[PDB]
Amino acid sequence: VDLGTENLYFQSMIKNIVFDFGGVIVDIDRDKAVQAFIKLGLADADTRLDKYHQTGIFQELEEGKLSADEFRKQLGDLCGRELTMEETKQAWLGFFNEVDLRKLDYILGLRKSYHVYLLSNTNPFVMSWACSPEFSSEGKPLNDYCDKLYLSYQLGHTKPAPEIFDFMIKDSHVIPSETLFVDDGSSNIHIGKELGFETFQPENGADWRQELTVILNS
Ligand code: NA
């Protein structure tokens, strides 16, 4: 079938759509991330890095408890050498594959009919790329695809903490039952459901456009 927006029709009680970034808009490859951090000297990266919820200094960075520079310093101490910001950024970008422009185009089409928000565990290294014209070959920052970004490191909590969902709900004024939450992570989906959201859990790396269209018309 043809998933171009002009072919698509939308009608249901859903008014808002909340997307995660990694695992939904852009593919995550944890093995590639592990390799990228090992390159810096983090020889035990395989035990440290997670697909859904970081721990240790990685969590602290994604909750804004460590600044990018502070994280760089503490990561360097683990690696036994002083890291630059650029090589630390490049390690973080190891988590990601280039974006499927089909997904970005689909999301632009959604904005004609829905309020679209991002709610994501992320950090300044990743966002310096995503929230810039370097995000993709289309030259539009992640900001162009949403009404507002809710970023863990600016809010002090990471999903699946209920607090990050609560901030987003209160700030955006969405009614959870009229909102579709799209996230590849099970724990995040479960708390979203508990708080009243409709949920859709796509597979990381999969083309979810068809199924999303079906859900938005259910
Ligand atoms: Na995700």
Swiss-Prot record:
This is D-ribitol-5-phosphate phosphatase. It is an enzyme of class 3 (hydrolase). One of its GO terms (biological process) is riboflavin biosynthetic process. Its EC number is 3.1.3.-, 3.1.3.104. Keywords: Hydrolase, Magnesium, Metal-binding. InterPro entries: HAD-like_sf (IPR036412), HAD-SF_hydro_IA (IPR006439), HAD_sf (IPR023214), PGP-like_dom2 (IPR023198). GO terms for molecular function: 5-amino-6-(5-phosphoribitylamino)uracil phosphatase activity; metal ion binding; ribitol-5-phosphatase activity. It comes from the Bacteria. Catalyzes the dephosphorylation of D-ribitol-5-phosphate and D-ribitol-1-phosphate. Is also able to dephosphorylate 5-amino-6-(5-phospho-D-ribitylamino)uracil, and thus could be involved in the riboflavin biosynthesis pathway. Pathway: Cofactor biosynthesis; riboflavin biosynthesis; 5-amino-6-(D-ribitylamino)uracil from GTP: step 4/4. Its cofactor is Mg(2+). SUPFAM superfamilies: HAD-like (SSF56784). It holds the Pfam family Hydrolase. Mg(2+) binds at residues 20, 184. Gene3D superfamilies: HAD superfamily/HAD-like, Putative phosphatase, domain 2. It comes from Bacteroides thetaiotaomicron (strain ATCC 29148 / DSM 2079 / JCM 5827 / CCUG 10774 / NCTC 10582 / VPI-5482 / E50). PANTHER family: ALPHA-D-GLUCOSE 1-PHOSPHATE PHOSPHATASE, FLAVIN MONONUCLEOTIDE HYDROLASE 1, CHLOROPLATIC.
